[PDB]
Ligand binder design. Structure first.
Ligand code: UUA
Length: 121
């Protein structure tokens, strides 16, 4: 009766600001985990007033901008962003993203769009 396993086949998959998200549909107030695929960048800067965003880099290479500070990232790195921190990123990467507490779109705030030409990837 308890659902323990979530598949890609049953996930919601969509493009948001230049990334391809795989939202499995985990419901758990403590944290939600999703997959992020990015070819060139996340062409939008945002922050979340409540949740920390932790990106594990499965493969590829990129650069995060966290409150405008460049943070290079490569395969096997863990990028840990606290709440209320402006986030965008460029790169060609596959990532596993944890949002803790659970992701709630009402907690996220739009700062700006970013031109696709800004990404060096
Ligand atoms: O976190 C990110 O880099 C991007 O992915 C989005 N996201 C992240 C987790 C989640 O469960 N659902 C989402 O839609 C977030 O809004 C942002 O655009």
């Amino acid at each position: 009766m308890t659902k323990y396993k979530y598949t890609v086949e049953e996930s919601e998959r969509f493009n948001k600001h230049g990334i391809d998200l795989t939202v499995y549909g985990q419901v758990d107030p403590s944290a939600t985990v999703v997959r992020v695929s990015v070819e060139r960048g996340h062409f939008q800067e945002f922050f979340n007033v409540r949740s920390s965003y932790t990106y594990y880099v499965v493969s590829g290479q990129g650069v995060f901008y966290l409150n405008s500070e460049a943070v290079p990232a490569g395969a096997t790195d863990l990028i840990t962003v606290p709440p209320n921190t402006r986030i965008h990123y460029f790169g060609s990467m596959e990532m596993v993203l944890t949002v803790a507490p659970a992701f709630n779109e009402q907690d996220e705030r739009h700062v700006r769009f970013i031109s696709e030409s800004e990404s060096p990837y």
